[PDB]
Amino acid sequence: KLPKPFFFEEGKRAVLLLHGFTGNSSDVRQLGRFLQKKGYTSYAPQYEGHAAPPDEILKSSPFVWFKDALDGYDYLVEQGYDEIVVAGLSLGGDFALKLSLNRDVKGIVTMCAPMGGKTEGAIYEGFLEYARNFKKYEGKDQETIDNEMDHFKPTETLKELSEALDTIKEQVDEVLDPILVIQAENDNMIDPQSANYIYDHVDSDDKNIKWYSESGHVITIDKEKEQVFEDIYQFLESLDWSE
Template identity: 45%
Template sequence: MKMKQPEPFMFEGDERAVLLLHGFTGHSADMRMLGRYLNNEGYTCYAPIYRGHGKSPEELIGVTAEDWWEDVQQAYQELKDKGYQKIAVIGLSLGGVLGLRLAGNTPLQAVITMCSPMFFDNEQQLTIGFRQFAKDYKKLEGKEDDVIQAEVEQLVDDSKELFQEIATSIEKVKETVDMIYTPTFVVQATNDQMINTESANYIYDSVESDQKQITWYDNAGHAITFSKEKDKVHQDVAQFLASLDW
């Protein structure tokens, strides 16, 4: 069965641009509702898809964590090449880690992290998430349960090196968060089962910006952009962006 592959989206608005970064195993659809909301508020919103994402799990483990960092840098440059000088970045989960890395390397109006990990002390949960993603994808392909189980187990085994790369990239960003002076908004679900929620406090406490905010959402899990709290998240993000000196 051939499935339609997701694509990046670009919602053009005014001169204020927002780069929307998805998480590990995700793609642009994870950020689409937020992108639409912000676009209705006037912002230009661009959501790329990193290499290997939005495709089969086999293709996902065929790339590296540094490839994704290059993809984020390229997406930022694409906005610059289109003439956007004022750019904020919003990242979900691993996208927030990449957003923090971008904030430490390039001038940004703001960085907003959403359920983003700083402590790689939960590799089992990362494995669970990847396993579920692979299983769901293969079900959509119409494969039998025994075939799915065998292929998923092989994928999990093959992904160990990639998970170690992800751990290294998270640690690299964690060590330099205190060098970020960009206005920062930390969005965190209280019932996040995928990451250590102390990550949110670490980001908030470590960034050196005079303009920073942290908000906890009690009725949300890790996929906060799809949660019951998504409307509140949209409003809070828009309010924070509106408070900036664009």
């Protein structure tokens, strides 16, 4: 079965966990379980068309995915959690920054978040590989996979993604809330210098950047995830919770 949103309820301090483009809640589930062990509630929404056949992404848009993130914040509030940190991986880190401008958060965590909308190379190739792997997961024979990929047209989706990222980069200077910026030094999906851009251009009064030298882009599931989780916990413990 494909992943679904999760909601791990513990104490009154809550974390909204946002996944990346073509990702899903499985990329943040271990972080959610760690946060639960430490007493924090977490909710991980999923973007429209994700955890589903890749054509559903082509029929959706980043505009909807950001609304899915906002809906996740609003779901936490409806469920009784008013004090929320937003933590996002990759595109979700961009959405975490933008969400902080649209909803009241106690803090922001960005994890390998890109700055700017370059899609040529790694993002484009990653999306095609995601689609090919999904069709093999569907049990399709090789001729069917090959022919469907000949007709898979990601250009409009990647253009929308690029424009959404460009817009968020121009909003970074509006960010005010406490922030932890996390980045893998050896990221082969985005420019790791994005992390310096975020750190230097937010207007937050409380900021920290952490680099990890042995992790790849999906840092929440890779070889240093335990240290990443501990660094997130120490950030959360430093914030202005009412309880």
